[PDB]
Design a protein around this ligand. Structure first.
Ligand SMILES: O=C(O)c1ccc(Nc2nccc(Nc3ccccc3)n2)cc1
Length: 294
């Protein structure tokens, strides 16, 4: 608390507020996430702490986990900018295609690693993705769903952002699979390409219907078991799937085919991170460096 000095606020997420903070002693600059409460569920501390042992080049390092005074703090290594800011900064020009492809490849590498270790993110979004000057991108802030779970808002007086949420989550499924992170990454991939969010829903039903309007209202043919899910209603309007050409123009067909496999309704048909890494879209992948304004 007094062992840092706040530099800036970085942002506000689903599970808390994030600050750029300088360690008073070592000079170290870190990203510090603050979550405010009866006091804490203590079960999480063991499993959140377990994430300190996630070690991989595409995952933002979790340095410490500290529970004190009705607060839970997560200390992360500091990266140079998040993807949301970079995308906004790139809005007029666009992120160069080879850089998009490098970022997607790297994000899949980090996911394939987490997933092989049975660790799901469940909240992916551009604010959760961090980049540096040498061209790396990293995923941050896993767990925190399997650990806490969420109400109408994030923590205090912020709504949940629905834009990246898998349909099976929106339909009320109690058991999530790693497939939910693939859906989120697919939505983010589309957004990097077109420079607009793919499914910008303002409510849970608006989110669902925006998905349906594009991809077609799911049924038992394309998604066995869909009509028996907790929040499914037979009264959903029936939209026909649109031609996929309008979704990520003008990405090439390898890109479109990969996105289409990331956006399958049935979590069982949805491509894995490991299989995605082998898709022909990545045959030519390189590692360019971004132009960042810090
Ligand atoms: O110029 C900005 O706007 C910005 C600058 C630096 C930065 N660095 C950073 N490094 C690690 C994590 C993180 N954010 C984060 C996200 C989710 C959970 C915990 C931390 N941000 C983020 C944004």
């Amino acid at each position: 608390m007094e062992n840092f000095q706040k530099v800036e606020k970085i942002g506000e997420g689903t599970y808390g507020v994030v600050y750029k903070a300088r360690n008073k002693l070592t000079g170290e600059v870190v990203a510090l996430k603050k979550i405010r409460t009866e006091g804490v569920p203590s079960t999480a501390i063991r499993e959140i702490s377990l994430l300190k042992e996630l070690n991989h080049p595409n995952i933002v390092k979790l340095l410490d986990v500290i529970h004190t005074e009705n607060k839970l703090y997560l200390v992360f290594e500091f990266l140079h900018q998040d993807l949301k800011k970079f995308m906004d900064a790139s809005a007029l020009t666009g992120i160069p295609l080879p850089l998009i492809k490098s970022y997607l490849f790297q994000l899949l590498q980090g996911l394939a690693f987490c997933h092989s270790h049975r660790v799901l993110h469940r909240d992916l979004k551009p604010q959760n993705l961090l980049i540096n000057t040498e061209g790396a991108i990293k995923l941050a802030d896993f767990g925190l769903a399997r650990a806490f779970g969420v109400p109408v808002r994030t923590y205090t007086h912020e709504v949940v952002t629905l834009w990246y949420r898998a349909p099976e989550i929106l339909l009320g499924c109690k058991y999530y699979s790693t497939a939910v992170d693939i859906w989120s990454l697919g939505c983010i991939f589309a957004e990097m390409v077109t420079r607009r969010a793919l499914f910008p829903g303002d409510s849970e039903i608006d989110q669902l219907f925006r998905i349906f309007r594009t991809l077609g209202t799911p049924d038992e043919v394309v998604w066995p078991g869909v009509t028996s899910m907790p929040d499914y209603k037979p009264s959903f309007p029936k939209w026909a799937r649109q031609d996929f050409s309008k979704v990520v123009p003008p990405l090439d067909e390898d890109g479109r085919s990969l996105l289409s496999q990331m956006l399958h309704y049935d979590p069982n048909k949805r491509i894995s991170a490991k299989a995605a890494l082998a898709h022909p879209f990545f045959q030519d992948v390189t590692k360019p460096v971004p132009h960042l304004r810090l």
